[PDB]
């Protein structure tokens with residue numbers, strides 16, 4: 044129990060216990076019973092959900108998916124195994140992984156019309172716009188299984204999203220440059236096949252560099268879930284209205300499209316580019332991922348920053364992931380798209396969770412009204 | 424002041440005062456200082472923003488835009504005057520309205536390529552999908568003024584949205600049926616011109632019914648803002664990341680696409696349709712808008728429900744708006760689109776507000792972790 048005393052006064056609140064981390068003080072019917080609200084910029088101290096998907100403690104600093112630490116999955120799992128784990132909450136036995144992997148492998152081709160629909164975008168349009176556009180359009184082609192309540196339908200569009208979203212991001216890249224779209228090769232991994240779709244020409248056969256593959260696969264594990272989140276709390280809110288799966292991911296994708304969140308990688312490069320386009324090099328808590336990322340960065344290795352890094356190791360992140368992506372040949376305007384591809388499983392897991400609850404109710408936040416109280420006067 | 428006492432105990436919280444309605448108890452750095460969070464399903468009792476845009480008291484029951492009651496604007500204003508008011512926070516003098524009205528009237532045509540892009544959707548696709556798809560695509564054609572920080576750019580895409588979104592919704596309708604798209608007539612009102620775009624053929628000239636016009640214009644005033652909201656808190660969250668204006672509206676549009684929120688009108692008709700497709704008529708707080716809406720409904724007047732209405736006036740809303748829209752010839756799958764057209768000014772006003780603040784910070788909600796704590800075992 045807690046007790047709260049407000050000018051009207053005064054109230055007792057249940058405490059809800061967390062299997063790890065901070066516990067919650069359950070607001071009741073806070074107004075009334077009390078005619079008062081909490082005010083909390085950013086929702087930074089408010090929790091509206093229970094989930095058992097990702098635990099983090101930065102101070103500690105821990106990141107686990109379903110209890111498993113990130114260093115272990117990064118080093119020992121795969122992006123697909125991680126998709127499975129996050130979504131259904133356990134690691135898969137050999138049959139379960141293969142059948143899940145099989146199910147995704149057979150849904151990677153888009154409807155030819157949805158392929159053609161890329162034709163309407165302008166001559167070399169930025170991929171981030173194209174991808175949000177195309178994801179909303181999915182409901183136009185896969186009307187088939189859109190019922191948020193029916194599962195099996197959720198299952199089929201969970202599959203469709205995990206399979207088709209890399210295909211879409213690879214096509215948006217091809218569109219952003221002049222290049223033909225390729226098709227899925229059944230003989231590749233999803234991640235390896237994603238890399239062909241992105242980088243393959245019809246002028247030659249494509250061989251994925253294995254070091255490249257493992258680097259990308261790992262990096263999607265590192266970015267698979269991180270919640271709660273701007274992006275995912277957005278998937279949660281839209282789903283709140285019982286929006287369908289696609290429409291909720293799209294909202295996650297739109298939230299992701301902003302520099303503070305999804306394009307932080309892109310901001311860093313932008314920092315870098317300027318310098319190379321101006322006179323140079325002058326003056327005026329550890330993440331478990333960060334450390335794994337520096338490691339894979341130092342191997343694979345930007346033209347150039349490294350000075351920057353060395354330079355202020357002397358005198359006084361998202362930074363490393365940017366360099367890597369660029370190192371693998373990804374142009375800066377694919378970074379946020381790469382982010383969504385990796386986060387997709389988390390977006391999905393949270394939405395599914397949200398659905399499986401005792402019953403969710405729609406999101407209805409408050410405000411502190413700070414305006415007027417007046418009468419209409421005719422326009423003269 | 425308030426004081427909160429928790430098992431660790433115990434803390435004092437500032438109170439932030441509202442010019443009307445409930446006041447807030449400002450969470451501080453709630454964890455730590457305390458290692459605890461609030462838990463509040465739906466955010467129902469939590470406020471993360473101050474705004475002075477819409478005040479409501481349902482119990483009372485009041486709805487005002489910028490201090491002005493809804494009955495007065497509905498009966499005496501226009502949808503455009505209401506757009507202006509909400510966004511810039513005051514009613515406009517004769518020059519300001521005309522110049523604002525002029526500015527919108529000259530931006531209603533889409534880029535011909537963005538027009539053509541409707542060609543890629545399937546043969547008679549539902550409008551709601553098409554509209555989310557096309558709104559995300561705006562950033563592809565109006566790269567021109569996308570800087571969330573630069574105003575004047577915000578101004579130009581505020582205009583572009585208010586002008587072009589009815590055009591887009593009218594085209595999505597035309598697409599949903601077989602029909603040619605028409606173009607804007609400079610000699611019409613936005614709302615009247617919207618109705619031509621929706622219902623006009625090239626086989627005859629279009630005359631808008633004035634009773635029809637006034638009915639639609641009023642109805643967008645009734646739906647112009649209502650916040651805070653699922654839909655608008657979603658626009659607020661996306662904007663939180665500094666997403667651009669279009670990407671934030673798109674998120675509002677996706678949140679709107681769900682039965683609890685934007686498609687409540689559509690749910691009612693769906694209730695109605697079933698009956699007409701099964702054996703019939705059997706058994707097992709006042710909104711200020713509601714009342715205005717019944718009034719305009721009874722004049723303009725569904726095949727049929729009215730029995731339903733009479734029938735349980737005997738024995739024991741969003742309902743009335745559905746009948747009207749259908750009465751004006753709108754098919755059920757335009758209802759949520761009609762909803763967005765009306766809400767657009769509110770979406771925009773809140774986003775702009777959010778921007779003009781001392782400085783917003785990104786949305787970072789919490790959770791109550793309720794999961795595991797385990798170690799990777801190889802897949803056998």
Ligand SMILES: O=C([O-])CC(=O)C(=O)O
Pocket residue numbers: 266269270271272273361
């Ligand atoms: O994963 C990242 O790069 C950061 C992130 O999503 C978050 O704070 O949610």
Ligand SMILES: O=C([O-])CC(=O)C(=O)O
Pocket residue numbers: 646649650651652653741
């Ligand atoms: O306006 C409506 O029809 C209901 C609504 O948006 C809300 O509760 O925010």
